[PDB]
Design a protein around this ligand. Structure first.
Ligand SMILES: Nc1ncnc2c1ncn2[C@@H]1O[C@H](COP(=O)(O)OP(=O)(O)NP(=O)(O)O)[C@@H](O)[C@H]1O
Ligand SMILES: [Mg+2]
Ligand SMILES: [Zn+2]
Lengths: 339, 607
DNA sequence: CCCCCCCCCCACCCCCCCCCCCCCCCCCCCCCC
DNA sequence: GGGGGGGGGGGGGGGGGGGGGTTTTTGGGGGGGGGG
């Protein structure tokens, strides 16, 4: 099945270079290392599991570069347009740039370090004539795009019915009330398989609602010996990610006259999980995306990225104690407008 | 004959048409500059033109009849020519819409017939069972990670196109021809919004003893959500068939037919006997001129239901209920309702049902109900499975469909109490709450209920108290703004008056009919009255004022210190505010409070 | 205490699978050294 | 007398084809409760 192809006003090699230059350059100097390299150092020390990319920072970086006279290709507009791809680009930039830890963490107890170290030893023996992994397996952090502050589409608080189909793929912010929330469940990122007949594990990255389990050992340790060894899934070596499904519903003021309040599924992953409770009135930024099940009609959901909620004592109580007439005034303060 | 050979000539003829009737060029440019301004100024007009089909006839009858009788071959060149016109304007495919004089192609879901398939038709009806809105995939774009090129794929189904192009299986690519792994690019990929609605035949038109027919309409992009259920509508579109109709041999059934649809091109809401009436400056000036007549409230209320004798205070209350007072929103989102809720309880044959039917014909948005015929679920909202997708979805009931309108309830005391238990939240909170089927929501039901009832006995018994005469609980009666008690009390003078009026009413003959042929002191007309109500609802929000407050507190304390309760006060405020709307006045004044107190005094005392 | 009411419960693409065909490998037999 | 080569059988792999994939209303009976 062949495909036609077209030219577009974007170049991901160029934008990858723009992203990594930003990542090693920017800092909030008006507040007086680079902000993101400091945050990545905190990730290296495993003290922080979330990288929050600010579109405000990309705007200020663009403004600085434009003040220095170079074009900057408006990366903010690009990554508001097609945010899903740019999560992958930012993670590649981080997985290249991220520094070593400054603080020690008792590393030997980490299974993924042990298993990939054993792989590296075996591959050194192979390479001595006697990528190393899928990148998601080694990527401990989670990456999120924080919207533009009002000072543009990620900034605007749409109602759910204002999310027309034209906004698919875009980073948008939606205003509503959470009507129900799922219990947290483990989604797979990378499935890990032990091989019984050679020991050399293999991995499957999963990008979809469903996957097919591997059986025959694809590794050359088996395949070059044409040994049809058996793969068995292991939870311990697999990378799971915390997954949770929520549903947001448009508020009573957003519903037009005589319409039903429309609603939208929210998918929240990683550290951002269980930031949403039912009954919360909230602005949620996320990538609005489709999912195939109908035929050409689509299921659609919001991949959550950022959450904005709408809504000392043992000595401060002495303010009222010393203020006095406490019983009378506190009694009058029950429903104070009621005679 | 093959369509492509004539496409160019059809394009240039529609281009000559658009050049000739330059109002369409002006419309295209007006849309473009509006959208450019609103894009830069930091809400968007659609890329759609309504052409008067009469203009296209007067230009070229052959092309006009081509649009009507063969739209699959004549709308694509017309839309191409229109898109080229929009391209010729300074700095996306443009779509067409049609109006006027369809002739035999003006139909209903009954008389729409298999002979009409693939023709352009106009259907009048009432909307029901609107689907959820869903994005429909029409193009997907894919970055080939190693190759660097952006591959793409177009998609087709029988709804996306006027002609039966080969289907495309809705599969996303995953590999280049060389086997290189693709990644799908949302945001460059293209999706149209898609919605499926059922237009039902108007029950007034359906012949003797047959139930209304219905047909399904498809709406795309900006036509989506232009209607809700219960809207009376005219839809224009291409009537089509789709699917295999059982010809695919897995289906053994010989007799089933083909599925059929209208692919919609425009959607007009209706209340012709338009849902929102247009007002000329002549209408504005006449409406203001009448508002300065010193007794305008009497003129308008006498102009309500001119075929009903008497009942003057009820028609006054009805007028103020059509023009309810301003709704208040307060701290912590606390809420005070602005509807006026009326209950007519009384003897038989006292025009209670006829007054409900007049209100049903006069308000901008009214929903009829009857006590036995209404379920409590059928009143609030009902869970159903949307067969378009398979999900549980709410269907709006009468109270929700009447939001920012009115509800008429005849035979109200005949309701079962599990129905009336569902009335309470609408009256008390202007809302209904659902907590079933895993659906936990609250819906707006902001509307004036007007209801008709009889006492527990067949006629009102003046020997006994109102709570003993009237079936309803006090916990429901207290929620109505005005409780009217009417009686058919016998009196020769009143009987003579009402009788000669009713005989004049029954001696009517509509224009043009022969004598005895079957059908197929200043007062305003009902179209004028409907326009006046729309004007006053839209354009004036009366502000409360101390000179009115003085009258209100004086009257409230006097009424209470001789059934009266705290709720009576904001009822008086609502009645005064609505009478200020009758005066078209930015303020409520002492006159409004005096009339409000006089009318509520009539309702309470039988004054 | 009896009767009537009213309340409750209930009915088209992709994967798995199976069949067919072709080639290769392994054993046995015969000849040659 | 043993080893190589040739020839035949048997097994395995690959390819191709095919088939499968719940609330809401209405009516009835029975049980429980209230009013004269
Ligand atoms: N004041 C009146 N003027 C003219 N016709 C009247 C008047 N009062 C009653 N009628 C007629 O009485 C008939 C019955 O009216 P209707 O509105 O059904 O009465 P109702 O109050 O609803 N009675 P019911 O439904 O039994 O409680 C209609 O045909 C009216 O035209
Ligand atoms: Mg009646
Ligand atoms: Zn193996």
């Amino acid at each position: 099945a062949a495909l036609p192809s077209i030219q577009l006003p974007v170049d991901y090699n160029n934008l990858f270079n723009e992203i990594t230059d930003f990542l090693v350059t920017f800092k909030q100097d008006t507040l007086s290392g680079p902000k993101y390299m400091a945050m990545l150092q905190k990730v290296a020390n495993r003290e922080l599991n979330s990288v929050i990319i600010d579109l405000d920072d990309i705007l200020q970086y663009q403004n600085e570069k434009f003040l220095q006279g170079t074009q900057a290709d408006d990366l903010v507009s690009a990554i508001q347009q097609n945010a899903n791809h740019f999560t992958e680009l930012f993670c590649r930039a981080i997985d290249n740039n991220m520094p070593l830890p400054t603080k020690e963490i008792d590393y030997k107890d980490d299974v993924l370090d042990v298993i990939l170290n054993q792989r590296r030893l075996r591959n050194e023996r192979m390479l001595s004539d006697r990528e190393l992994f899928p990148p998601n397996l080694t990527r401990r952090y989670f990456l999120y795009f924080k919207p533009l502050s009002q000072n543009a589409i990620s900034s605007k608080p749409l109602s759910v019915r204002q999310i027309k189909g034209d906004f698919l793929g875009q980073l948008i912010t939606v205003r509503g009330i959470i009507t129900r929330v799922s219990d947290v469940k483990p989604a797979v990122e990378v499935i890990a398989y032990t091989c019984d007949q050679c020991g050399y594990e293999v991995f499957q990255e999963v990008n979809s609602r469903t996957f097919t389990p591997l059986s025959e050992c694809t590794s050359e340790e088996c395949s070059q010996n044409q040994t049809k060894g058996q793969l068995f899934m292991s939870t311990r070596a697999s990378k799971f990610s915390a997954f949770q499904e929520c549903k947001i519903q448009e508020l009573s003021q957003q519903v037009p006259v005589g319409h039903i309040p429309r609603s939208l599924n929210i998918h929240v992953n990683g550290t951002l999980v269980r930031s949403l409770s039912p009954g919360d009135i909230v602005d949620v930024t996320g990538i609005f995306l489709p999912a195939p099940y109908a035929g050409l009609l689509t299921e659609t959901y919001l991949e959550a990225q950022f959450v904005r909620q709408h809504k000392d004592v043992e000595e401060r109580v002495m303010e009222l104690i010393t203020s006095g007439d406490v019983y009378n005034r506190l009694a009058k303060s029950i429903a104070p407008e009621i005679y | 004959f093959a369509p492509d050979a004539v496409f160019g000539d059809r394009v240039r003829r529609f281009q000559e048409f658009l050049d000739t009737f330059t109002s369409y060029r002006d419309s295209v440019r007006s849309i473009q500059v509006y959208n450019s301004n609103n894009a830069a100024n930091y809400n968007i007009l659609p890329h759609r033109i309504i052409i008067s089909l009469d203009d296209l006839r007067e230009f070229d009858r052959s092309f006009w009849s081509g649009i009507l009788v063969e739209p699959a071959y004549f709308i694509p060149p017309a839309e191409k020519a229109l898109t080229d016109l929009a391209d010729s304007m300074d700095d996306h495919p443009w779509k067409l819409s049609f109006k006027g004089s369809f002739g035999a192609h003006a139909l209903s879901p009954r008389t729409l017939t298999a002979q009409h398939l693939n023709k352009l038709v106009s259907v009048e009806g009432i909307v029901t069972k609107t689907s959820l809105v869903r994005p429909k995939l029409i193009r997907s774009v894919h970055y080939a990670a190693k190759t660097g090129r952006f591959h793409y794929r177009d998609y087709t189904d029988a709804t996306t196109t006027l002609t039966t192009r080969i289907p495309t299986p809705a599969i996303y690519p995953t590999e280049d021809t060389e086997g290189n792994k693709l990644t799908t690019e949302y945001g460059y990929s293209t999706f149209i919004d898609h919605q499926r609605i059922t237009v039902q035949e108007m029950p007034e038109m359906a012949p003797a003893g047959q139930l209304p027919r219905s047909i399904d309409v498809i709406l795309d992009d900006d036509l989506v959500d232009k209607t809700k259920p219960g809207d009376r509508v005219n839809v224009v579109g291409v009537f089509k068939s789709l699917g295999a109709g059982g010809m695919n041999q897995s289906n053994s059934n010989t007799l089933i037919g083909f599925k059929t649809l209208i692919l919609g091109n425009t959607v007009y809401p209706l209340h012709a006997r338009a849902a929102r009436q247009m007002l000329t400056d002549f209408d504005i000036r006449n409406i203001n001129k009448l508002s300065k007549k010193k007794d305008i409230f009497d003129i308008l209320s006498q102009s309500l239901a001119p075929s009903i004798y008497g009942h003057d205070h009820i028609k006054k209350a009805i007028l103020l209920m059509l023009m309810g007072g301003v709704e208040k929103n307060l701290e912590n989102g606390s809420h005070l309702r602005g509807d006026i809720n009326i209950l007519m309880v009384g003897d038989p044959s006292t025009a209670k049902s006829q007054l409900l039917r007049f209100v049903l014909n006069t308000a901008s948005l009214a929903i009829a109900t009857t006590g036995r015929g209404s379920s409590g679920v059928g009143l609030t909202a009902a869970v159903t499975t949307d067969r378009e997708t398979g999900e549980r979805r709410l269907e709006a009931g009468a109270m929700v469909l009447a939001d920012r309108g009115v509800v008429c309830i005849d035979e109200f005391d005949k309701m079962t109490d599990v129905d009336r238990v569902a009335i309470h939240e609408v009256m008390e909170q202007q809302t209904v709450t659902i907590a079933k089927a895993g659906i936990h929501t609250t819906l707006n039901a902001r509307c004036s209920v007007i209801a008709a009832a009889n006492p527990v006995f067949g006629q009102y018994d003046v020997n006994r108290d109102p709570h003993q005469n009237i079936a309803l609980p006090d916990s429901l009666l207290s929620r109505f703004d005005l409780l009217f008690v009417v009686t058919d009390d016998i009196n020769e003078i009143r009987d003579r008056s009402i009788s000669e009026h009713v005989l004049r009413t029954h001696r009517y003959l509509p224009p043009g009919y022969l004598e005895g042929e079957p059908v197929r002191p200043k007062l305003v007309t009902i179209p004028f009255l409907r326009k006046y109500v729309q004007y006053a609802k839209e354009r004036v929000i009366p502000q409360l004022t101390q000179e009115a407050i003085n009258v209100i507190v004086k009257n409230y304390t006097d009424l209470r210190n001789d059934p009266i309760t705290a709720r009576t006060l904001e009822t008086l405020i609502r009645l005064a505010t609505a009478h200020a709307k009758v005066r078209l006045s930015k303020t409520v004044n002492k006159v409004d409070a005096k009339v409000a107190a006089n009318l509520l005094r009539f309702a309470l005392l039988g004054e």
